[PDB]
Design a protein around this ligand. Structure first.
Ligand SMILES: [Mg+2]
Ligand SMILES: [Mg+2]
Ligand SMILES: [Mg+2]
Ligand SMILES: [Mg+2]
Ligand SMILES: [Mg+2]
Ligand SMILES: [Mg+2]
Ligand SMILES: [Mg+2]
Ligand SMILES: [Mg+2]
Ligand SMILES: [Mg+2]
Ligand SMILES: [Mg+2]
Ligand SMILES: [Mg+2]
Lengths: 369, 369
């Protein structure tokens, strides 16, 4: 039996999966060390990350050109890839071509990890947040603009339990257990949701939320997506490529409900470089935004400023989706994994391949063919 | 009369040359439009940029993932590649896969162009400077931290004739006609030469220059190089990989004379991502810094913290050199062009190839084979 695919994650030009039996595999661009195989070569097919065999990994998360993973039983976080600005969290700027433990996080109960371009954040089981990496625009939420090579606690969240965090190029977002939404970091395109285009050095609460509490948040490069308790979808920030999905190319400075999906309950969301994906509770995947390389997955190369359903063989329902910069990954109910978009770094995982504008199955990881 | 290479320039992962007959060609990574051929594909061999045939281009300059060129007779500056933050100068953020004229610069007599990661500068024949692109850390020299989608004049240089400018990832430097040296922008690794680790939003004069006037300046990603009237070489900023060249790994916050080359007169300089090149008046090329991919050109893959001479067949003298992020380009007295370092995007111009750690001849552009 082909191992169940438990988690997928996409970076700028690479792809990572966690499979049952606790094995990690990676593919795509390898030049910065983001695949973790020791060498610097691109891999066009899923390749087992041997250094993590036996380490009981339960999650993996891609940044633009780096990757983070963690083990619950080992109480360890690992990172590898481009090391500049401290994004790997080891107290230095060195690139890593094989995983190493983030010593500062050893023994800490991790709930969730998010990775942006050059900064990362971890949420603990007690709802505290630690952040590290580039901080030139306050994206670490630490109250200044100095980069951090090691994780630091966000003191601004003292007394406020955090449920999940998200990170874009140079901005950050979070939702609390009580349903509050926050933004901070680089804010020039309205992507913090605070009603202006200025940065924040500490988390600031988003007050315009359509009267709704929020359960989920995700970040694209310069846009942000959230989901409410009623399953409504909100987008804000940059829409040069229509990635907000409102049927035009206008930016929004506060969360704006995507009315076209109002009859659906959204269960998962992902933000890409200039595109966006949302998954409904009945397993339908919608994509929109930039489609130059086919990354929307709708079988053409027209940009899309409104949500369009991504179709799969036999209409099999989708269970996970993750956006890269120029590609998209998805897992279905049948335990098939699909990829589409740009394929030049091997990130689609289907062997040497032309770009694809509709879903293509990754046979190496899938039950079907 | 046989085809000669007149000018070469290296970007992060691409390479561009101007040939006799006023022909522009390019090779290497194509994904962001930086090659200018209209498509997004890598080219492993030199490819003529036909859209500029007949435009009488006289110079080309690569940024990380974009390219600029200009024509005297046409009084036109052109740009193409990744468009974010306004680095192409057209008053919008659109990528370009084909050269477009920078309307704001039409009819201006151009002396020199410099390109960083996300910002560019142009010096006019009267010694004025215009800048455009990313400005988050003050690198445009305009007194603020707001990006500019079009060229703007640096008013700080009113009454001060600028000779040449240079741009790194997020910083900028300049020398005046009477030999003063300036720095501005992101300054966290001491790379401005001002004695601290703090950014500047407007040009600030470097006061500790060994009592010497400077004739030229160049920038690497986070380091800076200058040459005095007496041909002495100075480096400052980041030396994590030994790219300052002083035989150790210490950062310098003010210019520091590279003593090992004191008996040579330096004629040309270039800064890469994490490596450096300097050429003597006798045609000897020296390289140092990060050498993971062989980009120092000395026949191994060990980093070099002191200058080592790059050797060429029959000891032919070098006349031009340009550093990319992971590769290096050079032209010799025999009108041969050589390349070395990372080759995975086709940036060496030698057809499909493994990485190279010593100079390899580009047959398409050379007399010898
Ligand atoms: Mg990149
Ligand atoms: Mg995850
Ligand atoms: Mg601090
Ligand atoms: Mg290829
Ligand atoms: Mg073409
Ligand atoms: Mg201004
Ligand atoms: Mg440079
Ligand atoms: Mg000493
Ligand atoms: Mg250079
Ligand atoms: Mg290859
Ligand atoms: Mg690449």
């Amino acid at each position: 039996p082909p191992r169940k695919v438990l988690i997928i994650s996409a970076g700028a030009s690479h792809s990572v999966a966690l499979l049952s039996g606790d094995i990690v595999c990676s593919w795509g661009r390898g030049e910065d060390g983001q695949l973790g195989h020791g060498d610097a070569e691109d891999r066009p097919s899923p390749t087992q990350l041997s250094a993590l065999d036996g380490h009981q990994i339960v999650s993996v998360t891609c940044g633009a050109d780096h990757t983070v993973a963690y083990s619950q039983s080992g109480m360890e976080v690992y990172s590898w890839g481009w090391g500049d600005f401290g994004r790997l969290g080891h107290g230095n700027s060195s690139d890593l071509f094989t995983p190493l433990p983030i010593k500062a996080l050893h023994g800490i109960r991790i709930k969730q990890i998010a990775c942006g371009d050059s900064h990362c954040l971890a949420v603990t089981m007690e709802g505290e947040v630690q952040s590290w990496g580039r901080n030139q625009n306050g994206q670490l939420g630490l109250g200044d603009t100095e980069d951090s090579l090691v994780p630091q606690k966000i003191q601004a969240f003292e007394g406020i339990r955090i449920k999940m965090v998200a990170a874009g190029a140079e901005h950050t977002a979070a939702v609390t257990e009580d349903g509050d939404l926050y933004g901070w970091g680089w804010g020039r395109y309205g992507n913090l949701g605070l009603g202006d285009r200025t940065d924040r050095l500490v988390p600031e609460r988003v007050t315009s939320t359509g009267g709704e509490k929020m359960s989920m948040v995700a970040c694209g490069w310069r846009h942000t997506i959230s989901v409410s308790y009623s399953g409504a979808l909100y987008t804000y920030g940059w829409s040069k490529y229509g990635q907000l999905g409102h049927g035009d190319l206008e930016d929004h400075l506060i969360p704006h409900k995507l009315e076209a999906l109002s009859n659906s309950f959204i269960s998962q969301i992902s933000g890409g470089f200039r595109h966006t994906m949302a998954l409904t509770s009945d397993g339908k995947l919608y994509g929109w935004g930039w489609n130059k390389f086919g990354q929307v997955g709708v079988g053409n190369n027209l940009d899309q400023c409104s949500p369009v359903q991504v179709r799969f063989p036999d209409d099999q329902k989708v269970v996970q989706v993750s956006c890269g910069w120029r590609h998209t990954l998805a897992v279905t109910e049948r335990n098939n994994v699909f990829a589409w978009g740009r394929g030049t770094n091997g990130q689609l995982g289907i062997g040497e391949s032309v770009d694809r504008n509709f879903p293509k199955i990754i046979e190496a990881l899938s039950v079907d063919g």
